[PDB]
Structure 1
Amino acid sequence: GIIWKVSPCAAWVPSAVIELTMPSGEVRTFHPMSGIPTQVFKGVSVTYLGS
């Protein structure tokens, strides 16, 4: 086989790339869909929507 994984979002909204700096000194990456009020969970903080 040659296998394909597929998903029907059927939409397009702006998003960006974010790197984060915990005051302790941790650095954890993630991709927020900040055009949609999505809530990504990590550690203690959560980032959300933009313009």
Structure 2
Amino acid sequence: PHGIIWKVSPCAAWVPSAVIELTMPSGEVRTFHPMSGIPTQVFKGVSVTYLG
């Protein structure tokens, strides 16, 4: 009747991560969240990843 909605995401890794505010030399400025070894949705060539 109420409609309570929950969102569960199981995980058992707990790898370190960080945020990256990248600015392209052309002028485009965006942000993305890289993971420890996982690609971060490469934005036109740049595939900077984070290591732990």
What is the TM-score normalised by the length of structure 1?
0.64
May I ask how many residue pairs the two structures share in their alignment?
Answer: 50
Bigger radius of gyration among the two: 2
Give the 3 Å change call, closer, same or farther, for CA 24–41 of structure 1 in structure 2: closer
Runs of 4+ in 1 over 4 A off after TM superposition: 35-46
Query: Residue 3 in 1 paired to residue 16 in 2?
Result: no
Percent of aligned pairs with the same residue? 100
Give the 3 Å change call, closer, same or farther, for CA 40–49 of structure 1 in structure 2: farther
Question: What runs of 5+ residues in structure 2 fail to find an aligned partner?
Answer: none
Give the superposed CA RMSD.
Answer: 2.9
What is the TM-score normalised by the length of structure 2?
0.63
Between Structure 1 and Structure 2, the one with more strand by share is: 2
